[PDB]
Amino acid sequence: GSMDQNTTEPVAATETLAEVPEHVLRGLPEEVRLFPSAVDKTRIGVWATKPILKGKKFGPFVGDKKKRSQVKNNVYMWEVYYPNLGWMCIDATDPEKGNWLRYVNWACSGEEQNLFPLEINRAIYYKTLKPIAPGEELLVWYXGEDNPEIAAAIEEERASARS
Numbered sequence: 079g080s081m082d083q084n085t086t087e088p089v090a091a092t093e094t095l096a097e098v099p100e101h102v103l104r105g106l107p108e109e110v111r112l113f114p115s116a117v118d119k120t121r122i123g124v125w126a127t128k129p130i131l132k133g134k135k136f137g138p139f140v141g142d143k144k145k146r147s148q149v150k151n152n153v154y155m156w157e158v159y160y161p162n163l164g165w166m167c168i169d170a171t172d173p174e175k176g177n178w179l180r181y182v183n184w185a186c187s188g189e190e191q192n193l194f195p196l197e198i199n200r201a202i203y204y205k206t207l208k209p210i211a212p213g214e215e216l217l218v219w220y221x222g223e224d225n226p227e228i229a230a231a232i233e234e235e236r237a238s239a240r241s
Contacts, residue, residue: 087213088114093122098181099173106178107136110216117183117215124181126192126210133234134206136193139179141168141202153218154180158200168202179204185217188227193218196232207231 091114095103098112108128115123139154146167149155154176155169170176182204185191193204193216204218207227220228 088116091116091120095122098122098178102173102176102178102181107134110178112178112181113215115181115183117217119181119183122181123183124178124216126214126216127212129212130192130206130210132206132208133231133238135203135235136205137179137201137203138198139202139204140170140175140177142170142175143167144169153182153184153195154202156195156197156202158197160200168200182216182218185219190214190217191219191227192216194227194231195220196228196235198236203235205231205235 093114095112103112106124110124111127112122113125115121117123141154141156143160143166146157149167149169152169152171154171155167157165157167159165171180182193188207192206192208192210192214194207195218196203196205207230210216222228
């Protein structure tokens with residue numbers, strides 16, 4: 079053995095877990111915690127602090143409804159048709175209007191991605207295709223039009239959402 083210890087956690091950022099808007103961290107998954115965006119935004123980022131199982135359903139993502147005219151290299155945003163006004167864009171990327179999901183960064187190849195984009199009932203859910211250990215940054219991607227990370231993990235959530 080000898081080589082089985084745990085990887086030391088990052089330190090020294092600038093922003094503090096206590097700094098994220100109390101309302102955003104307030105509606106977290108099981109009991110996730112905010113940790114500086116040591117991932118990219120190098121400010122505050124959201125990480126697993128509690129255990130996660132494959133097929134988990136975390137969300138739904140606040141998602142504010144605005145026109146695509148906005149957005150610019152983000153994730154917590156998508157286009158959905160409204161039976162009340164037509165094809166719309168849902169974006170929430172702010173501390174005040176954007177919850178914690180707005181703090182989710184990006185992955186690499188389903189091996190580290192912990193959350194995956196899902197459109198349901200004009201609502202965007204974030205689901206886990208793989209268990210995540212407390213200390214892992216929550217991340218997403220898949221452009222991956224109709225990739226199987228999207229369908230396969232969708233099936234277990236939606237399929238299970240029935241029988």
